[PDB]
Amino acid sequence: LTVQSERAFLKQPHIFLNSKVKVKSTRPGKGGRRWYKDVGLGFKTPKTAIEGHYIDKKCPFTGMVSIRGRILTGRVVSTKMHRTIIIRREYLHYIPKYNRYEKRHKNLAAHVSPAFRVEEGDMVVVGQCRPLSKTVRFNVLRVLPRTGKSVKKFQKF
Amino acid sequence: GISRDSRHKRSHTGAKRAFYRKKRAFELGRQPANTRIGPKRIHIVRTRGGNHKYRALRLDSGNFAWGSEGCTRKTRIIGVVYHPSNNELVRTNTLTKSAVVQIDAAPFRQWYEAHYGQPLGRRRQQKQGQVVEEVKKSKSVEKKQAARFAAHGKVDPALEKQFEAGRLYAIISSRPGQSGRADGYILEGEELAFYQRKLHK
Amino acid sequence: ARGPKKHQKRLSAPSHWLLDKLSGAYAPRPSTGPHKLRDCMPLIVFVRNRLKYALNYRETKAIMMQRLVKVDGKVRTDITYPAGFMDVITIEKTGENFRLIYDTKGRFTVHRITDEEAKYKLGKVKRVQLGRGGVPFLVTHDARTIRYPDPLIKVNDTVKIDLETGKITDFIKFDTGALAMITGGRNMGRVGVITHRERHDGGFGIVHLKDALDNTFATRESNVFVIGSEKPWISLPKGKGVKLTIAEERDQRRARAL
Amino acid sequence: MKLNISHPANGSQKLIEVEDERKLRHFYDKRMGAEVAGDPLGPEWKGYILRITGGNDKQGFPMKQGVIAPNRVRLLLSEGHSCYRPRRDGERKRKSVRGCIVGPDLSVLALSIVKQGEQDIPGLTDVVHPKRLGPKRATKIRRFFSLSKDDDVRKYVIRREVQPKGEGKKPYTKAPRIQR
RNA sequence: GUCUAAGUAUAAGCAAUUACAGCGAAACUGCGAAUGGCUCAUUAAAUCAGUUAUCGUUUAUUUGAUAGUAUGGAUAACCGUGGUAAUUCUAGAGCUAAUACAUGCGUAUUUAUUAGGGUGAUUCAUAAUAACUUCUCGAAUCGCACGGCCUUGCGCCGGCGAUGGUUCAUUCAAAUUUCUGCCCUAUCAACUUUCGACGGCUGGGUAUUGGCCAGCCGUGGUGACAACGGGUAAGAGAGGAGCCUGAGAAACGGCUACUACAUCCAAGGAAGGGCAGGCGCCAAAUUACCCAAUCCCGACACGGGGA
C-alpha cells in the first residue's frame, strides 16, 4: 500500500513469489525472497538492494538488466528526474590548429536504482546496459559522494 | 506499410533529423491483434527465419495455473475486469497481458472437490447428488485424504466469495498476437485485495 | 552488401593465399564451412598454387570427383568449401599425407607426413558447456562436437583426438609457463613460451610471453593456441617458430646453405 | 448452339449442331447442375436426361460456377480455379468469364450424360473407346481385378504393345510398373 | 535456367532380350534470380572510420552431435471433342503415379510451479511437474551390393551411399549498439514540447532492445567548453495507393484498383509499360572474335555467364 502502488499498478519481480509463501516448501524452509542478485564485476550489493522492498524491473539487483565489459564514471547534472541522472563527462580535446587542449562536455543519462543514497554533485560510476530508452543506455552503480558544485565545477574525470 | 524505426523522430537536442534512406523490410511494425472472445479465428503470420507466428484474433479457452498448488486446468474465459493501461480496452473488453479476467471456477473447483473432499462455492441449502466425494476410503486413503483434509483445505475468504460467484480473478501473462493463446495465472491474497480494490476504484 | 555475394575482389585478397594480381577481376572466394575467412585455405589454393599439382579446373575437378582425395576420411568433392587448420590431407597411394602448419613467418605450409602422425589431429577446445541430457560436452575450435569428455577437461586445452571418432586421447593444458602458438595481434603466427596470464575483467584476459631470446609480447586468449608441452606430436616447423630478425636469420641461411 | 455432349462410361462425346431455337427454349435460363432431358430436344431422342456443365461464349469466353446476374462479369481469378491457367505461381489475375444463366449468347455447350434413352447413337454410345492408361499401383490393381491380399500382382499385366512397320523383327511388349 | 546411377517415365520415341528397369524429350517435384550491371533530386558525426556489445536478435546453407517412451484421393503430362479474330485465352469428358498435397490400432509451442557446470554476474545452461496448441518431429522413399543363421523359411538378420527430419553447434551473413573524429560560420542564442520533447509503470507489435507506439502522470532534453540555424565546395529510381514470395526484398524489367499516354481487333474485347546505335542541342575511334584463362551459378564433369 506504500511502494506497491506507484500510480501504475504492478510492482513484481519476474519470478512471482508473494502469494504462494503459504506453500509448504519455502516457508518451512527459507525461500521467502525479495529477488536477490549480484551485479558482479568487482562490486558489492547495497543493503537496500539486499532487502529493500521497492520493486523495479530496470534494477540491476532486482530485475534482469545486466552489465558487460565497459564501465563508466561521471558527475550528475540534474539528479531531480523520475529516477534518471544526467552526466556531464568533460574531456580535453586536442585542437591541431592551436596545438592545444580545450574543454568539451557531454551528457549521458542513467536509470536510477532506489538502493543507494543519492546526491547532486556526486561522482557516480555507471555501466553500459541494454538500451532501455534512447538516451538511457546505462545504469547507476556506485556513488562516490563528493561536494562538487554545479555548472561552475570542472574536472576531466 | 507501417513503420517502427528510431529515425523518424526529433533529436535529444530537439531538431528533427533529415531522413537519409527509405524504408527497408527489417524495420516493420505489424498490426496489433485486439483479441476478442468467441470462435477460433487465426492468422498465422510467417516471421523471420521461417518462424511462423501464432496470431490469435479470436479465442474461447486456455489453461490457467492455480499458483498455490501448481495445478493447471483448462478454463473457459468469461470477461475482462481491469487493465491499468486503457479503459477503452476494458470498455470493449479486449484481452491482453496485464488484464485481470474473471474466470470459470468450475474446473478448479472440481479439482477441489475431485481431490480434497471439502465444499466451496455452494449455497447453505447444502444440496448433494451422487457419491464421488467419498467414493471409497481405505485406511490408507482415510489417513491420507483425511490427513490432507485436517489442515490445508483453506482459502482466502474473498476468493471463497468468488467460488460462490464461481468466477475468479485470474491475470493474463501470455500475449495472443504472438503466441496464439491468452493464458495467465490466478491472483491470490494481497494482489486479490489490490485488484478487487481496483474494482473498488 | 545487403545479402551474400560469392565474388572475391583481388586488391583486397589477403595474405595467406599468394594469389596473382593478374588474370581478370575475381579471386577464388571460399564459401561456408568449419572455419572463418582468415585461417581458411581451399583446395583450389592448395593443390594448384601451393603444390603446383594442377593446370586448370578440368584437371582439378578431374582429380577431386574420382574419389582419391580425403579430408578426415570424407570425400569432399567441393572447391569452395575450406580445408581446416593444422591440416591432415591425403595422398593415400604410397602412404603420404600433408599437414598444414605455420612457417616461422606465420603463414601456412604443406608437409608430407606419415600415416600415424597424420592420423591423429591436434584440435583446440572452443567450448565446454551444458547441452541436452544434462552433460557438459566439448565444442572444438575446428569442426566437431566431442560429446561425453572427461568432465574436468575445460576450454583452451588443445586435444590430441585420434580424428576417427573425435575422442580425447590427450590434451595440452592451458598454462602459464608453457609453449604456445599465437595467431593474432601485432605478432601473429609465432611459436613462443608464455610467462604469465592476466585476468582483465572487461574483455579478453591476456598472456605475457617471453621467448627463447627475451622478447616480450602480451596477446589475448582468443588467439593463443597451446601447441605442445614438449612431446613432439606434430611435425616441427622451420626454425622452431622463433621468428628472429631478417638480417641475422639471413646470415644463418647463408651459413647453412649448401 | 453446338453441343459437346459428354459420355463418361464409353469415353465418347460429340459436338452437335442445334437448329430450332425452339429446341433451345427449354435449354434457356437453366443454371448449372440442373437436368434437362433429351426428349424435349429430339423426336429421335427419348429417355436421356442430361446435366449442364459448361461450354464457351461467342468470342471465346469460358464459364464459371455460381455466377448469377448473367452477363460477362470481369471476374477476378486466383490459383486453383476453373477457366484459368496461372501466368506465374501465386498469381491472381482478373479475367473475363461468363455467368451461369444460359441466354442465347452461347456458342458451344458442354453437357453430361446422366440417363440413357432408347434410341441408339453410333458415335456417342455405340462406338467404343476404353481408357488409355490403366491401374498403376498395386492396390489399384487389387481393387479393379479383385486380388484379395495373398495373390502377388506380378502375373496381372495391363500391358500395351507397339508394332512398327519397316521393322521387321518382333512386336514390342510394354508393362507400366507396379508400385507398393 | 536447371538432371545425379541414387525422385515420379506405359512418349503407339529410340533401342535390346512381363513388375518397371538401358537411352530418354514432355509433364509433375525441388533449387533458382535480395544479384550481372544500369538512370539522377541527393545524402554535412544521421551515415562512416576506428571501437564495444547483444546476459536485447534471425540465418537457406556448411560440417559435426544428434530422438528407451504416449497398402490412401487426386491431377498435370496423356487420349479425344472442341469454342473465338485471338496473344502463357482456354472448356468438357476420361485416364494415371510420385521424396508431390494426406493418413499413421518421448519431443516441438505457450502458461505457471520447483530443482538448478559456466561467467565478473543473470531467472544462464540443464531437469522435473501440471496441463496447453485446433499438434511440428520420431521415414508407407531412391539407388548400389548381394551376403551370416541355416527355421532354404514367396525367411530372419545384412551393409554402402543419395534424399528427407525435431534440437544444439559452426560458417556465411543480416540487424541494431556504444568513447572519439564531420568542411566553414555568429547577418545564428535560443531550440525541442503538433497529437512524445525526456523519464517511468502497464501493455502492444518488431526476430528482439528502444515513446517505436497508445493510456497514465511526472518535468523535461540541449546550448557561447559552441546547441540550433545557415552555407553544399558528398543515397533516389510511366506514378501514387495496397498486396503477395523467401533465409534474406516493402522484390516492381511479378499481381490489384486509380491516374497520364499508347498498340492488335472481326469494335463486344484484349495483350502494353529497357538501355545501348545514328543524326543533333557536311561526315572523322569496330554495328569485331571468345568463356580458352581467372572467377561465379544451378538435380549438377556436360548446362549457363554483357565480369
Coordinates of N, CA, C and O in Angstrom, one line a residue, chain D residues 35-114:
Chain D
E35 N -30.9 -30.5 -64.7 CA -31.1 -31.7 -65.5 C -32.2 -31.5 -66.5 O -33.4 -31.5 -66.0
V36 N -32.0 -31.4 -67.7 CA -33.0 -31.2 -68.8 C -32.8 -32.4 -69.7 O -31.7 -32.8 -70.1
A37 N -34.0 -33.0 -70.1 CA -33.9 -34.3 -70.8 C -33.7 -34.1 -72.3 O -33.7 -33.0 -72.8
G38 N -33.4 -35.2 -73.0 CA -33.2 -35.2 -74.4 C -34.4 -35.4 -75.3 O -34.4 -35.0 -76.5
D39 N -35.5 -35.9 -74.6 CA -36.8 -35.9 -75.3 C -37.3 -34.5 -75.6 O -38.0 -34.4 -76.7
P40 N -37.2 -33.5 -74.9 CA -37.5 -32.1 -75.4 C -36.6 -31.6 -76.5 O -36.9 -30.6 -77.2
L41 N -35.4 -32.2 -76.6 CA -34.6 -31.8 -77.8 C -35.2 -32.5 -79.0 O -35.7 -31.9 -79.9
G42 N -35.1 -33.8 -79.1 CA -35.4 -34.5 -80.3 C -36.6 -35.3 -80.2 O -37.0 -35.9 -79.2
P43 N -37.3 -35.4 -81.4 CA -38.3 -36.6 -81.5 C -37.6 -37.9 -81.6 O -38.1 -38.9 -81.2
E44 N -36.4 -37.9 -82.2 CA -35.5 -39.0 -82.3 C -34.8 -39.3 -81.0 O -34.1 -40.3 -80.9
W45 N -34.9 -38.5 -79.9 CA -34.4 -38.9 -78.6 C -35.5 -39.0 -77.6 O -36.5 -38.2 -77.7
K46 N -35.4 -40.0 -76.7 CA -36.5 -40.3 -75.7 C -35.9 -41.1 -74.6 O -35.5 -42.2 -74.8
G47 N -35.8 -40.5 -73.4 CA -35.3 -41.2 -72.2 C -34.1 -40.6 -71.6 O -33.9 -40.7 -70.4
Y48 N -33.2 -40.0 -72.4 CA -32.0 -39.4 -71.9 C -32.3 -38.2 -71.1 O -33.2 -37.4 -71.4
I49 N -31.7 -38.0 -69.9 CA -31.6 -36.7 -69.3 C -30.1 -36.4 -69.2 O -29.2 -37.3 -69.1
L50 N -29.8 -35.1 -69.1 CA -28.5 -34.5 -69.4 C -28.2 -33.5 -68.3 O -29.1 -32.7 -68.0
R51 N -27.0 -33.4 -67.8 CA -26.6 -32.4 -66.9 C -25.7 -31.4 -67.6 O -24.8 -31.7 -68.3
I52 N -26.1 -30.1 -67.4 CA -25.4 -29.0 -68.0 C -24.1 -28.7 -67.2 O -24.1 -28.7 -65.9
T53 N -23.0 -28.6 -67.9 CA -21.7 -28.4 -67.3 C -21.0 -27.1 -67.7 O -20.7 -26.3 -66.8
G54 N -20.8 -26.9 -69.0 CA -20.0 -25.8 -69.4 C -20.2 -25.4 -70.8 O -21.3 -25.3 -71.4
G55 N -19.1 -25.0 -71.5 CA -19.0 -24.6 -72.9 C -18.3 -23.2 -72.9 O -17.5 -22.9 -72.1
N56 N -18.6 -22.5 -74.0 CA -17.9 -21.3 -74.3 C -18.9 -20.3 -75.1 O -19.7 -20.8 -75.9
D57 N -18.7 -19.0 -74.8 CA -19.5 -17.9 -75.4 C -19.1 -17.8 -76.9 O -18.2 -18.5 -77.5
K58 N -19.9 -16.9 -77.6 CA -19.4 -16.3 -78.8 C -18.2 -15.4 -78.4 O -18.3 -14.7 -77.4
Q59 N -17.2 -15.4 -79.2 CA -15.9 -14.7 -79.0 C -15.2 -15.3 -77.7 O -14.5 -14.6 -77.0
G60 N -15.4 -16.6 -77.5 CA -14.4 -17.4 -76.8 C -14.3 -17.4 -75.3 O -13.3 -17.9 -74.8
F61 N -15.2 -16.8 -74.6 CA -15.0 -16.7 -73.1 C -15.5 -18.0 -72.4 O -16.6 -18.5 -72.9
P62 N -14.9 -18.4 -71.4 CA -15.3 -19.6 -70.7 C -16.4 -19.3 -69.6 O -16.9 -18.2 -69.5
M63 N -16.7 -20.4 -68.8 CA -17.9 -20.3 -67.9 C -17.5 -20.7 -66.5 O -17.0 -21.8 -66.2
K64 N -17.8 -19.9 -65.5 CA -17.5 -20.1 -64.1 C -18.8 -20.7 -63.5 O -19.9 -20.7 -64.1
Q65 N -18.7 -21.1 -62.2 CA -19.8 -21.7 -61.5 C -20.3 -20.8 -60.4 O -19.5 -20.2 -59.6
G66 N -21.6 -20.6 -60.2 CA -22.2 -19.8 -59.1 C -22.2 -18.3 -59.4 O -22.0 -17.6 -58.4
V67 N -22.3 -17.9 -60.6 CA -22.1 -16.5 -61.0 C -23.3 -15.9 -61.7 O -23.2 -15.3 -62.7
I68 N -24.5 -16.1 -61.1 CA -25.8 -15.4 -61.3 C -25.6 -13.9 -61.4 O -24.7 -13.4 -60.8
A69 N -26.6 -13.2 -62.0 CA -26.6 -11.9 -62.8 C -25.9 -12.1 -64.1 O -24.8 -11.6 -64.3
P70 N -26.6 -12.7 -65.1 CA -25.9 -13.2 -66.3 C -25.5 -12.2 -67.3 O -26.2 -11.9 -68.3
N71 N -24.3 -11.6 -67.1 CA -23.5 -11.0 -68.2 C -22.1 -11.4 -68.0 O -21.8 -12.1 -67.0
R72 N -21.2 -10.9 -68.8 CA -19.8 -11.3 -68.7 C -19.1 -10.4 -67.7 O -18.6 -9.3 -68.0
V73 N -19.2 -10.9 -66.4 CA -18.5 -10.1 -65.4 C -17.0 -10.4 -65.4 O -16.6 -11.6 -65.6
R74 N -16.2 -9.3 -65.4 CA -14.8 -9.5 -65.4 C -14.3 -10.0 -64.1 O -13.9 -9.2 -63.2
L75 N -14.4 -11.3 -63.9 CA -14.2 -11.9 -62.6 C -12.8 -12.1 -62.2 O -12.0 -12.5 -63.1
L76 N -12.4 -11.7 -61.0 CA -11.1 -11.9 -60.5 C -10.8 -13.3 -60.2 O -11.5 -13.9 -59.3
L77 N -9.8 -13.9 -60.8 CA -9.5 -15.3 -60.6 C -8.1 -15.4 -59.8 O -7.2 -14.6 -60.0
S78 N -8.0 -16.5 -59.0 CA -6.8 -16.8 -58.2 C -6.4 -18.2 -58.6 O -6.8 -18.8 -59.6
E79 N -5.4 -18.7 -57.9 CA -4.9 -20.0 -58.1 C -6.0 -21.1 -57.9 O -6.9 -20.9 -57.1
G80 N -5.8 -22.2 -58.6 CA -6.6 -23.4 -58.3 C -8.0 -23.3 -58.7 O -8.9 -24.0 -58.1
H81 N -8.4 -22.5 -59.7 CA -9.7 -22.4 -60.2 C -9.9 -22.9 -61.6 O -9.0 -23.3 -62.3
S82 N -11.2 -23.0 -62.0 CA -11.5 -23.3 -63.4 C -11.2 -22.1 -64.2 O -11.1 -21.0 -63.7
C83 N -11.1 -22.3 -65.5 CA -11.1 -21.3 -66.6 C -9.9 -20.4 -66.4 O -9.9 -19.2 -66.7
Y84 N -8.7 -21.0 -66.0 CA -7.6 -20.2 -65.6 C -6.3 -21.1 -65.5 O -6.3 -22.0 -64.8
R85 N -5.3 -20.7 -66.3 CA -4.0 -21.2 -66.1 C -3.1 -20.1 -65.6 O -3.1 -19.0 -66.2
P86 N -2.4 -20.3 -64.4 CA -1.7 -19.2 -63.8 C -0.5 -18.7 -64.7 O 0.3 -19.6 -65.2
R87 N -0.4 -17.4 -65.0 CA 0.7 -16.8 -65.7 C 2.0 -17.1 -64.9 O 3.0 -17.6 -65.5
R88 N 2.0 -16.8 -63.6 CA 3.0 -17.3 -62.7 C 2.4 -17.9 -61.5 O 1.2 -17.8 -61.3
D89 N 3.2 -18.5 -60.6 CA 2.6 -19.2 -59.5 C 2.2 -18.2 -58.4 O 2.9 -17.2 -58.2
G90 N 1.1 -18.4 -57.8 CA 0.5 -17.4 -56.9 C -0.2 -16.3 -57.5 O -0.8 -15.4 -56.7
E91 N -0.3 -16.2 -58.8 CA -0.8 -15.0 -59.5 C -2.3 -15.1 -59.6 O -2.9 -16.1 -59.9
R92 N -2.9 -13.9 -59.3 CA -4.4 -13.7 -59.1 C -4.8 -12.7 -60.2 O -4.9 -11.5 -59.9
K93 N -5.1 -13.2 -61.4 CA -5.4 -12.3 -62.5 C -6.9 -12.2 -62.6 O -7.7 -13.2 -62.6
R94 N -7.4 -10.9 -62.8 CA -8.8 -10.7 -63.2 C -9.0 -11.0 -64.6 O -8.5 -10.2 -65.5
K95 N -9.7 -12.0 -64.9 CA -10.1 -12.3 -66.3 C -11.6 -12.0 -66.5 O -12.2 -11.4 -65.7
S96 N -12.1 -12.3 -67.7 CA -13.5 -12.0 -68.1 C -14.1 -13.4 -68.3 O -13.8 -14.0 -69.3
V97 N -15.1 -13.7 -67.5 CA -15.7 -15.0 -67.5 C -17.2 -14.9 -67.5 O -17.7 -14.1 -66.6
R98 N -17.9 -15.6 -68.3 CA -19.4 -15.5 -68.4 C -20.0 -16.2 -67.2 O -19.5 -17.1 -66.6
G99 N -21.2 -15.6 -66.8 CA -22.0 -16.2 -65.8 C -22.6 -17.6 -66.1 O -22.4 -18.2 -67.1
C100 N -23.5 -18.0 -65.1 CA -24.1 -19.3 -65.2 C -25.3 -19.4 -66.1 O -25.5 -20.4 -66.8
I101 N -26.2 -18.4 -66.0 CA -27.5 -18.5 -66.5 C -27.5 -18.4 -68.0 O -27.0 -17.4 -68.6
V102 N -28.0 -19.5 -68.7 CA -27.9 -19.6 -70.1 C -28.8 -18.6 -70.8 O -30.1 -18.7 -70.7
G103 N -28.3 -17.7 -71.5 CA -29.0 -16.9 -72.5 C -28.7 -17.4 -73.9 O -28.1 -18.5 -74.0
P104 N -29.1 -16.7 -74.9 CA -28.8 -17.1 -76.3 C -27.4 -16.9 -76.8 O -27.1 -17.4 -77.9
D105 N -26.5 -16.3 -76.0 CA -25.2 -15.9 -76.5 C -24.2 -17.0 -76.6 O -23.1 -16.8 -77.2
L106 N -24.5 -18.2 -76.2 CA -23.5 -19.2 -76.1 C -23.2 -19.9 -77.4 O -24.1 -20.1 -78.2
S107 N -22.0 -20.2 -77.6 CA -21.5 -20.9 -78.9 C -21.6 -22.4 -78.7 O -22.3 -23.1 -79.5
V108 N -20.9 -23.0 -77.8 CA -20.8 -24.4 -77.6 C -21.0 -24.8 -76.2 O -20.3 -24.4 -75.3
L109 N -22.1 -25.6 -75.9 CA -22.3 -26.0 -74.6 C -21.4 -27.3 -74.3 O -20.9 -27.9 -75.2
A110 N -21.3 -27.7 -73.0 CA -20.7 -28.9 -72.6 C -21.6 -29.6 -71.7 O -21.9 -29.1 -70.6
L111 N -22.0 -30.8 -72.0 CA -23.1 -31.5 -71.3 C -22.6 -32.8 -70.8 O -21.6 -33.4 -71.2
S112 N -23.3 -33.3 -69.7 CA -23.0 -34.5 -69.1 C -24.2 -35.5 -69.3 O -25.3 -35.2 -68.9
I113 N -23.9 -36.7 -69.8 CA -25.0 -37.7 -70.0 C -25.3 -38.3 -68.6 O -24.4 -38.9 -68.0
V114 N -26.5 -38.2 -68.2 CA -27.0 -38.7 -66.9 C -27.8 -40.0 -67.1 O -27.3 -41.1 -66.6

